Design a protein around this ligand. Structure first.
Ligand code: HAS
Ligand code: HEM
Ligand code: CUA
Ligand SMILES: [Cu+2]
Ligand SMILES: [Xe]
Ligand SMILES: [Xe]
Ligand SMILES: [Xe]
Ligand SMILES: [Xe]
Lengths: 554, 33, 166
């Protein structure tokens, strides 16, 4: 291959995506079996016959968790927030480093997947101590997350190098999103790394016989909340800078897109205590502070709601948008690249309301650790983030390989996307319903059939969802592999440009946008927000450490 | 052209969604309080 | 057109944001109110109370389950609860109405959940830490405790009991 020699960035991107979607498939198969579990049907003896290695429901849950929420998304971000800024700047990433970051993800993945497959790490994706997994679960996951640190370096390098060539000019939109993304992410990952270097890693090698559970989960949710925004913003980058092109219109305001991403650099990390509303040893006033800051982090998403909506109305009207709702029928509902994220954005609407509920401190106690929590983030990570990812196959995958899309394939995906969406909406009502009826999550509830009899009617939805989504998932696997198995190649659409969306600009832009490009300053603001929100609390925990020995309960 | 009437429609749906959820959850808390 | 549209949108966007904030400040208001009323009790105690998880049921308040309940004021009763791998001590917990029960909960093994169905009592239990919550049940009858944090193969099965008297 020639394409691969002057743009070797295309090949490296695909190896990130393939490994990312493969981890989606292997991780997702446990979903339907879990959806029925909450419909009070026990599907697992069937699964034990299919997959002999699966030992328990919770080893299935750890795999579902880690391979989707941790491996799939992190390999999607690494694919998008490196390649996209590289395609706008038309510059090559330091290649030696890009492959060193891919192999790290792959060596890091293999080394950690064995202890999971060998049931030596039935601990779930949050791996709260004192539940001690095998040492190779921790070492492997370390190398897996530390991979993003080389990606950060690469995008910051691309940025440094662009600045060098155009002195005094404003950072281009996509790069700006990419740059404030990986900076935020670096601030975020510090809580995980410190948990890893201080406790988890020495623990599983035996160096230390104990770990404090309170510092271990305080540092976790340091990284534990921004990493959900490390999932989202890759889809947000694609909805801002690519969707308005796919809908037949423009992005209505560039400075609004920059301000949305700026607030996410500010209010991303210092909100962890919303996850620890029901934990001991944390001053109630510290939480009321982190409750308010989380409501503030709702603002970035509230702005996006209007900025995109006006862009879609702008698109629909240009295609011939009629009265108040006439623009809706005028969109290109024939293109899976358009249908996928929009639907997700609809389902995102109940998703955010559920979210703002959980942030309200005292109201958390109502829903905490019930089925409601999964009902919330499935409308978030499993709907909008994954649907965007699925749709994005229909443009990005042509641009990487040079293989085109047939009319059979274009239609097959539309169904997949309509089902997946229709399957996630049915489930949502199911878990929100049962969560308000006290059904705990993280539990093999089918194996205790007489425990939740008042949840008769939502259990119907859960059963229904698992069937529809199993169908949706299979069709996807089928549709994907056909694209990746054809010997059809046009090396010219492998060289066609990415369909970025053009931006409406005004006079009031200049002075604003110019202020937000003061990156080094805002990064320092973001860091002092962390020291102010976490430093006081962490210091008090560090003086009074209380390690407890390791346990294995699977 | 004119007023983003349709966008105002979408954010309002979102305003009602947050209110039915939040105020709804504010009910069960006191009824469990 | 286009330049007419850019201006019109950033106009309705300044308002939208002013509305969202004011609506958020209402949300900040109503939370503040619930922190002022009786209902604010279920929020865990702020102060660190360290314990050894390996001595817990040999020496100290949690050792004898016949000793878990202890009246400590006029209308006050302290219940020392113990959430272990797949079970709760004491089983059952017996308590009176109109009385303000102050739970003090801990684990000898792993992190367990403590969720009392039909109440706001929803607190995590961490080995090496006492979790202190307050509640005055107004309703009488049969209370069922549920473990809502993965704690082992028999997690789905770890139910507890609070027994409240008329
Ligand atoms: C990627 C997935 C993530 C999304 C985004 C998400 C949302 C929120 N969350 Fe969350 N979350 C919490 C805070 C929030 C807030 C404030 C929102 C915000 O990030 C989102 C606000 C959303 C909005 C304000 C809506 C914007 C809507 C838009 C932008 C769409 C408009 C539609 C259009 C334009 C369509 C037009 C189309 C046409 C056709 C017209 C809290 C506490 O405050 C808990 C704890 C619960 C508990 O106790 O366990 C929690 C639970 C979770 C868990 C479970 C963790 C566990 O295993 O322990 C995960 C993984 C997760 C992540 C995610 N979460 N969350
Ligand atoms: C194949 C379609 C899917 C279905 C039917 C499904 C269903 C479920 C259900 C019912 C649960 C609750 C199980 C329990 O708490 O015991 C769950 C857990 C979870 N799901 Fe999914 N899911 C699907 C795909 C996904 C995807 C694509 C993601 C991420 C992109 C995801 C992320 C998660 C996470 C993070 C958990 C909780 C992990 C933990 O607490 O250990 N799921 N899923
Ligand atoms: Cu104790 Cu789950
Ligand atoms: Cu969060
Ligand atoms: Xe991993
Ligand atoms: Xe790490
Ligand atoms: Xe880790
Ligand atoms: Xe997480």
């Amino acid at each position: 291959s020639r394409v691969y020699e002057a743009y070797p960035e295309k090949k490296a991107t695909l190896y990130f995506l393939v490994l990312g979607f493969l981890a989606l498939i292997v991780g997702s198969l446990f979903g339907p079996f879990q959806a029925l579990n909450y419909g009070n049907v026990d599907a697992y003896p069937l699964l034990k016959r299919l997959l002999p290695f699966v030992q328990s429901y919770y080893q299935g849950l750890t795999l579902h968790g880690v391979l989707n929420a941790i491996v799939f998304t992190q390999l999607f971000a690494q694919a998008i927030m490196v390649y996209l800024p590289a395609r706008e700047l038309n510059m090559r990433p330091n290649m030696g480093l890009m492959w060193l970051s891919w192999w790290m993800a792959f060596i890091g993945l293999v080394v950690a997947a064995l202890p999971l497959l060998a049931n030596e790490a039935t601990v779930l994706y949050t791996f709260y101590p004192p539940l001690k997994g095998h040492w190779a679960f921790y070492l492997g996951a370390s190398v897996f997350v530390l991979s993003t640190w080389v990606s950060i370096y690469i995008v910051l390098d691309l940025w440094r190098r662009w600045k060098a060539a155009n002195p005094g000019k404003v950072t281009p939109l996509v790069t700006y999103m990419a740059v404030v993304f990986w900076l935020m992410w670096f601030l975020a990952s510090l809580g995980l790394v410190l948990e890893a270097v201080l406790f988890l890693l020495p623990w599983s090698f035996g160096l230390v016989e104990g770990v404090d559970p309170l510092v271990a989960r305080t540092l976790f949710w340091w990284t534990g909340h921004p990493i959900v925004y490390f999932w989202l913003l890759p889809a947000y980058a694609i909805i801002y800078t690519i969707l308005p092109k796919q809908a037949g219109g423009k992005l209505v305001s560039d400075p609004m897109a920059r301000l949305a991403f700026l607030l996410f650099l500010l209010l991303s990390t210092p909100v962890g205590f919303h996850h620890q509303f029901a934990d001991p040893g944390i001053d109630p006033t510290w939480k009321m502070i982190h409750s308010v800051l989380t409501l503030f982090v709702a603002v970035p998403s509230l702005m996006t709601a209007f900025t995109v909506a006006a862009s879609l109305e702008f698109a629909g009207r240009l295609r011939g948008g009629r009265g108040l709702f006439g623009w809706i029928r005028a969109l290109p509902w024939d293109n899976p690249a358009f249908v996928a994220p929009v639907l997700g954005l609809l389902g995102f609407i109940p998703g955010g309301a559920g979210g703002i509920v959980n942030a309200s401190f005292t109201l958390d106690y109502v829903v905490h650790n019930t089925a409601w929590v999964p009902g919330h983030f499935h409308l978030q990570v499993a709907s909008l983030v994954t649907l965007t990812a699925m749709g994005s196959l229909y443009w990005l995958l042509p641009n990487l390989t040079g293989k085109p899309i047939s009319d059979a394939q274009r239609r097959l995906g539309l169904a997949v996307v309509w089902l997946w969406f229709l399957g996630m909406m049915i489930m949502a009502v199911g878990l929100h319903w049962a969560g308000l009826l006290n059904v705990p999550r993280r539990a093999y509830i089918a194996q205790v059939p007489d425990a939740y009899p008042h949840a008769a009617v939502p259990m119907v939805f859960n059963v229904l969802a698992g069937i529809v989504l199993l169908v949706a998932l299979l069709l996807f696997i089928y549709g994907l592999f056909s694209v990746l198995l054809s010997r059809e190649r046009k090396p010219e659409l492998a060289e066609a440009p990415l369909p970025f969306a053009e931006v409406i600009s005004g006079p009031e832009d200049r002075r604003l946008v110019l202020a937000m490009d003061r990156i080094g300053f805002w990064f320092a603001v973001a860091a002092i927000l962390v020291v102010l929100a976490y430093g006081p609390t962490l210091v008090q925990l560090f003086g009074h450490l209380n390690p407890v020995p390791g346990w294995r309960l699977w | 052209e004119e007023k983003p009437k349709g966008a105002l429609a979408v954010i309002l749906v979102l305003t009602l969604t947050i209110l039915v959820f939040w105020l709804g959850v504010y009910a069960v808390f006191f009824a469990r309080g | 057109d286009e330049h007419k549209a850019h201006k019109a949108i950033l106009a309705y966007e300044k308002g939208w944001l002013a509305f969202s904030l004011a609506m958020l400040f209402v949300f900040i208001a109503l939370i503040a109110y619930t922190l002022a009323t009786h209902t604010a009790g279920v929020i865990p105690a702020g102060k660190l109370e360290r314990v050894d998880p390996t001595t817990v049921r040999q020496e100290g308040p949690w050792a004898d389950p016949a000793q878990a309940v202890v009246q400590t004021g006029p209308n006050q009763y302290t219940v020392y609860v113990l959430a272990f791998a797949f079970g709760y001590q004491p089983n059952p917990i017996e308590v009176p109405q109109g009385a303000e029960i102050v739970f003090k909960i801990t684990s000898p093994d792993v992190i367990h959940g403590f969720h009392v169905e039909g109440t706001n009592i929803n607190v995590e239990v961490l080995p090496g830490e006492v979790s202190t919550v307050r509640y005055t049940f107004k309703r009488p009858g049969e209370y069922r405790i549920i473990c809502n944090q993965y704690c082992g193969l028999g997690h789905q099965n770890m139910f507890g009991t609070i027994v409240v008297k008329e």
